[PDB]
Design a binder for this molecule. Sequence first.
Ligand SMILES: NC(=O)c1ccc[n+]([C@@H]2O[C@H](COP(=O)([O-])OP(=O)(O)OC[C@H]3O[C@@H](n4cnc5c(N)ncnc54)[C@H](O)[C@@H]3O)[C@@H](O)[C@H]2O)c1
Ligand SMILES: NC(=O)c1ccc[n+]([C@@H]2O[C@H](COP(=O)([O-])OP(=O)(O)OC[C@H]3O[C@@H](n4cnc5c(N)ncnc54)[C@H](O)[C@@H]3O)[C@@H](O)[C@H]2O)c1
Ligand SMILES: [Zn+2]
Ligand SMILES: [Zn+2]
Ligand SMILES: [Zn+2]
Ligand SMILES: [Zn+2]
Lengths: 374, 374
Amino acid sequence: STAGKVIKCKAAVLWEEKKPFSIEEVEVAPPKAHEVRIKMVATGICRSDDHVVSGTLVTPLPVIAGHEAAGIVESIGEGVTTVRPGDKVIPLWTPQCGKCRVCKHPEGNFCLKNDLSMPRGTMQDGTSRFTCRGKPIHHFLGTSTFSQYTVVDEISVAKIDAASPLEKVCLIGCGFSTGYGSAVKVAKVTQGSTCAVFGLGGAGLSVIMGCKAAGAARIIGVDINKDKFAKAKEVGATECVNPQDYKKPIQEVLTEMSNGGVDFSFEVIGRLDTMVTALSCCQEAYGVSVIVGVPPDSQNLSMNPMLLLSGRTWKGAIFGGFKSKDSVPKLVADFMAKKFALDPLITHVLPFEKINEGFDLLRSGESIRTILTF
Amino acid sequence: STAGKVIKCKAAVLWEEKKPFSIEEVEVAPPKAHEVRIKMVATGICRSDDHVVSGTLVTPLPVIAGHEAAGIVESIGEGVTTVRPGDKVIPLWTPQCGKCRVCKHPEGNFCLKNDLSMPRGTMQDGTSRFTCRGKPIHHFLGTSTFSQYTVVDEISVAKIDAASPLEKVCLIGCGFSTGYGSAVKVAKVTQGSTCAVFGLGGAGLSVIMGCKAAGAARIIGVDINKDKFAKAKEVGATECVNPQDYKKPIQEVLTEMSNGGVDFSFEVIGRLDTMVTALSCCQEAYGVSVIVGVPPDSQNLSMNPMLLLSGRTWKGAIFGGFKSKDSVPKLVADFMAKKFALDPLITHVLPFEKINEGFDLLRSGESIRTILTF
Ligand SMILES: NC(=O)c1ccc[n+]([C@@H]2O[C@H](COP(=O)([O-])OP(=O)(O)OC[C@H]3O[C@@H](n4cnc5c(N)ncnc54)[C@H](O)[C@@H]3O)[C@@H](O)[C@H]2O)c1
Ligand SMILES: NC(=O)c1ccc[n+]([C@@H]2O[C@H](COP(=O)([O-])OP(=O)(O)OC[C@H]3O[C@@H](n4cnc5c(N)ncnc54)[C@H](O)[C@@H]3O)[C@@H](O)[C@H]2O)c1
Ligand SMILES: [Zn+2]
Ligand SMILES: [Zn+2]
Ligand SMILES: [Zn+2]
Ligand SMILES: [Zn+2]
């Protein structure tokens, strides 16, 4: 039995930025009260994990990254009431403590117990459960899924369907739910509308999936990598444009295509310039632009306030506006019910050990989602 | 009489930027097809009229500014069906052609026939109806109310209650409807919410009126001129704070005051810094910030997109989001039904002749609204 004892296993540790992960042994302390130790089954490679490697998303190093995954509860600590050993679960990188101001608000989902705004790289109690080479290692967004085992606080774990295919539903841990929720929940795309989606990767395809579900008459995919267009069309994009093909700025191009601006635009890249462009391309009087992309650490964008004064609405969101713990199981349920598909997002599958190759696949632009199996 | 003939009358002409208005005689051509010549009865001095003088709001000079007003139709042109001579009317600086995508949109109001985005300073047909000393003078937002008589396009005029007190209802032409709608229509202030209003002048006090009407439990007024606090509280503010009384940034103070950020914030000054501050002080996960102020010409603001990514909604709005020709008559009716008050905004009432004195009362910080009677 491992319940109550330290577990040695392998994890992909990031020691320095812009360096390959180090698959080596780590010691995982047993779960304290209201914490859960999960045996990871599958984890997806989201761009945000690479953001950590690149310094785009700053969080304390050395760290065990990963935040989009699914596994099986190994053991629970004292007082845990929502999961039991043997349960299939999805780690919530955006917690749902249910007690804070945001959690009790009918709309807000960015729990104040989150570790995304001011990254500490610890458990809710300010400590770590990871030791490598005798050195304490940092957690990432309280999940740290790039490990055969991880310990998370109770508020950062959701029990899902016992019959859920973990190699697929892991995407509901981030990529899918983010893009999908951004369209249907945050921007609230309407029937007959024209949408523009900047960035046709895992999250952007999910946004297209969200707009299609919402009944958008037009969904224009925007990406500088034309190789991304086929997949986009496949999931709902009615047309795709590459900014590099035009002699004029894309927001102008898009404004002409939509005869005056789109109803809903989405920034799913993570650049300051595309954020402004996405805003500029939605109709000046009633257009809505939603930021999904993670910006470079601490950098400020420059924009003219008249873009807003005319009537535009600009907002951003975390995890697609989904109250994590309530939503994740409902989303897995719907997937089981064939309400939406995850297959189109999965382009590569690799064993955990091949984690480094997976990030090269992302970086080459060859992939959308590579799922890592433990 | 005057009908179908050229009328000679007094108007306040701004020949150059940063100059007092020149009260002289001008010639008002008769209305053309679908135009209306209106005899002005009362016009409110709005801060935007001063923006023109200061160059903050660029529009072709020389010109007859003025947009917040009420008058009586003197004669209508061939094809006018909405108003008739003797009708009490209110000119609309944001028209409602009723045929463009925006007017047809359930939530759009910034009509595509507007002259604010790219000021021409002409009638819808590209020409002027004003002549002064043999020289053609520009129109302002298609209204030009600083004249005893003016000619506006039918789409820029609304018929109002015949028993309307024109010297009060003229505020419905701008300041009041703007602030009121911003709060109840655009921001959509919820019952029991905490609001923060930056700028306590005529538009700001109206934002407060709307917030209170919307049920806001807490309404914090913010202004660097403490003299503005008495009236703000009179109209609804629960507390007022002067930024310069604090050693630390006001968004900090407001965040501490609202225990994490306010629900709704409003920028009603016209500064890039207070626009970012306003957004920053509303709760990060579900706060809504509305820009009401007109920023200085051609300047960009700088902000960190994380403010939005966390969940904040940032909007802006022209004329309080009200479809002009539809709402103005409705608002007047409600005023007549004692649904809201206009007297709190009226601090000075001067003759048209004293136009410059009123601008001086505004500039000095002494007035909220000065109504000029012709
Ligand atoms: N808010 C959240 O909760 C949240 C969640 C998931 C992902 N994200 C962020 O969204 C972004 C994308 O995630 P992904 O996994 O879908 O990424 P990805 O790398 O798979 O996709 C980014 C895409 O944008 C394209 N692109 C790059 N520069 C472009 C440009 N200048 N113009 C047009 N297209 C351009 C790339 O070719 C690529 O197809 C990342 O920044 C990620 O951190 C945010
Ligand atoms: N969007 C629209 O349709 C619309 C309509 C009407 C007015 N406006 C704009 O709203 C703004 C305000 O108009 P108003 O008529 O109420 O004018 P106003 O000048 O009477 O009110 C401005 C107030 O803000 C205060 N202020 C200035 N700097 C400040 C600072 N740094 N911090 C805090 N407070 C400060 C002033 O003391 C004053 O009370 C202007 O830019 C005006 O052009 C926009
Ligand atoms: Zn992610
Ligand atoms: Zn919470
Ligand atoms: Zn119109
Ligand atoms: Zn005004």
